Amino acid sequence: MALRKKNSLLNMANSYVLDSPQPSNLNYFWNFGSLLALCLVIQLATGITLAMHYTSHASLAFDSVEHIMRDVNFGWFIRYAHANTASFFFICIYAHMGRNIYYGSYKTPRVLPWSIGVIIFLLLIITAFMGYVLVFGQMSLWGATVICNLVSAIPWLGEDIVHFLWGGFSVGNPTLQRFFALHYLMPFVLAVFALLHLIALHTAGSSNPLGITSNVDKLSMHPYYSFKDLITVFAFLLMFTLFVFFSPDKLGHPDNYIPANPMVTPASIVPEWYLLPFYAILRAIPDKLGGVIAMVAAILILLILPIVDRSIIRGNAFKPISKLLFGFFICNFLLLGVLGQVHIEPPFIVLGQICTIFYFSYFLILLPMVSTIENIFFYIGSL
Amino acid sequence: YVKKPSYKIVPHFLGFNIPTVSKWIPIFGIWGAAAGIGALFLIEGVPRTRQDILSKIPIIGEHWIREIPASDNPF
Amino acid sequence: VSPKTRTSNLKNGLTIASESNPLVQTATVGVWIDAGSRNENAYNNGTAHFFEHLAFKGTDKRSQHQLELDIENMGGHLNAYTSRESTVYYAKSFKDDVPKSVEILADILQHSKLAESAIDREREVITRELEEVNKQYEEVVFDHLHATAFMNQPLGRTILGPRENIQTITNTELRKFITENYTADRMVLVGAGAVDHDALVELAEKYFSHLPSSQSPVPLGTPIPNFVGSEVRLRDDTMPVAHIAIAVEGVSWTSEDYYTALVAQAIIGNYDRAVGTSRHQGSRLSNIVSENNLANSFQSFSTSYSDTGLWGIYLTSENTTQIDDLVHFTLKEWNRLSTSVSNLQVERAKSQLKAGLLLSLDGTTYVAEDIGRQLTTLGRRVTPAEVEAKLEAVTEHDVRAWAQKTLYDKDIALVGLGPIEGLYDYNRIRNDMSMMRW
């Protein structure tokens, strides 16, 4: 027996990256998995390097980031790489979740990797939010203020919990130092969950774009998907290069280059672009607590896709009505994103509410209805 | 003479029926008490828990009404 | 509606009990004795079984050969068995051959030779039986199960007795045993099938009238057992099938919980992959085991004695890597007798038992065994009407209450024989006797 199969440790590697049997028809949307792993590795490498130059104390934090930009050799690159890869991480994670929703990767037998994935998504959001605060510019501080005060909505204990998170009476030095420690840690927790959802997936193997079994026709992960993954790695690095080297601040907020000032509140406080859809959902509900619950529910509702999709067919490749509904859902998610960054003014107030209703009604009404109807149309249609 | 066996199907859902669940109702009660006792115990230190819950308990409640003398409190 | 079981006594105190069936042409008469291995001490353990081999080795009148011929000439046969608490000697014959059979039985019990030459001859036959029971796995498992459950107590002893006693049993000890134990107040002459009761009572007055009465006549089925949670593992990797029994201390014949225990046993039930219908049985455990091929078979049992019992299950499996699952699921099904059983399971099992207790009584030997067993354990035959009322009195609440006192979190006796590498240690088995979720 060959070594890679004999030796317990090598065999674990082998089982995941080399002999792993994959469907032979995975399309390029199966490549986001590896890009997300690449983002995770870039973030770890750049993040650990930034940690060697950054000072978490609020009197020095912003200046330490300027010191990285100006004084540390290639500091500019490491900082921009870290900040831009945070954006690319979300593009790829949304792409990956989009792939999973369209192709019914959440259905049995892959509910577990899907459900662990929803947790990974929450951890990514928390990681990225804390990292943003560490710059301690104006958006850093004011973002932390707004977002941590959402916990004030928890009845009875809310206020006490916020002061406990802050380590004080407002966002300040204690908060920044604790966010540093947690921002360092959270990516390791995230990597563990990423690995767990893979281990969970390995029982069923990858889905494929037809939604039929691949047990009939498998391909080794290497060399075929190894070399196919290189294409998107180089495509990603080209996009990375254009941002990092030529437009490093396109995805950022200028206000974060002003030092945090607890007195002056910035003209518009928006979160980073990738949180904007959830921000729009929060604004849609007028109640404080309602808004928080809605915002959280917008993520946790993903957990019910296994239930509300009633289809006898996995994924949308063959379901014209489901494909149209999916298209509208995705465009609505982008509209929510846009409404997250407009001013709270007419007519965007009402529009935001309608988009929020559409977001939830996809899971609760339309997908269950449409999937039931398409079941019937396939049966009657093929009689 | 009996022509057919005499039975009905009780309503069920995900393999649970009301006769079975009703036997477990008390047990959820006790676990809820255990969770209540446990939760309250974990936050007994939280000042709000003492102020709003624990100090209002008859007899026992004076255990949680404790003042630092003004002379010994720097803040 | 079955014909009435008639019961008469003699002067000495021998009970005669009969159930006539004028639809059959054959009759089973015999003597049920409220005595067995349990009545021996440690020095004469094996005596009762020894005697059973010598009862047929000739009497004062007929030699061994004459005896053989006399029974051959009857047309039917004689049969005997000794258990822990009961000894039976019966004769199946034709209708009109019953006077011959009662005469032969009376002869072999009262007037047996027990000649030193025959003691010495059987001493080798019985020694060879020690090395051939080894094959009857069910009995090996249950004999070890009694041995461990009732460790160093009379019920824990084997029926055959140790090798050492077989070599030292004398005609004196044999004589003393049957003189002390086979007394009229401990015996029941039973007839089933084509027998007249009044004819049978006359035959008893003719043959069993000069039986000794005991000094202190206690009623029939009168008894201190202290169950030991324990295990015996007899691992044998060369065996293809594992046999496992698990038991808790069960109920005596006269327990108030006797029927409740039967209902509980019926909820778990039996299973056998060789029987066609078994994959469709209602029992939860049956479903789990059949879907997962965890076992070849299982058999719930509730063995009763005068003052104790064992209640448990006997499992056989070739699936040697999943014995852990089989045992896990079995004991979790027992947990549900304490936590979950509702009128659904209880009413289903009562329906199954209301018939089951009557269906067992097929031919004359089963009827005779039923009359004999009930008379020597309860002192009366319980009519089907009484049995139907006692079963109807078992509620779901009673089953739960019984299980919570008898099974839940209780010590088990556990015997595994064969390729039982996969059977976990005692603690992990015993830990399945409760549910942490409840």
Place this chain on the structure above:
Amino acid sequence: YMGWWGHMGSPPQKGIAGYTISPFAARPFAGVVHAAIFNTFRRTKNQALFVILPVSFFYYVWTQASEKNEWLYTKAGRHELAKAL
């Protein structure tokens, strides 16, 4: 649900003969021009509606919303703004 090489969990296969040639024997870019033009046009044409419909609708909605918003915060839109608040 999935095994491993040698016991993958396919239903039994029989009667399919598979043929292929070495990567060194094949032109990797054979018929690339035809594919890049005709095949991509076919695949794009068949999916175009599922993209165009939602994109066009949400872009129209956004355009109407952004134009109204812009107009409400002009002088001309003073009255309509006052009513909207």
Place this chain on the structure above:
Amino acid sequence: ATTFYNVFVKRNSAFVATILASAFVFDMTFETAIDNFWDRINAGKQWKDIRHKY
């Protein structure tokens, strides 16, 4: 004594409830008892013992 087992130990829900309630009682009483013990062995040494002068 059967009754005690049956009520507080037989159901694990009950046993865990009992353990946590006992932990609550223990925690509160042990705190008070150590406070008093510590004050007796360190008598006249602590601030609370000299505070009265000021």
Place this chain on the structure above:
Amino acid sequence: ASITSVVKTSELILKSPLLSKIVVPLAKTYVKFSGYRQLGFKMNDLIIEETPNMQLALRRLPPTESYDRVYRLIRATQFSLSHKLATGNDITKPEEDDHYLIPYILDVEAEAFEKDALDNLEVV
């Protein structure tokens, strides 16, 4: 959802003259636009099979049907990876789109649903 549910609901529709008059033409166009026939699949090839019930139904297929199903899946997987469509005889014609699997799964499910019902019976 269960195949049983889909089949029962479809039978309710096909019974009602009104309903069938409006649904049958819609369902036929749906299936034409679905386009699974363009990869040489039969409708039943698409049904999710990673459930114990469906694994049982597939095991109950006659050998011939089973071998041909495997071929259609392999063939379709190859069309998918090549980004080609079936041509000629590989396209499933409407007359070849037979419900080869529906009877087997309906029987598997019928027994599993009977089993669930009977596990909940109450002696009256």
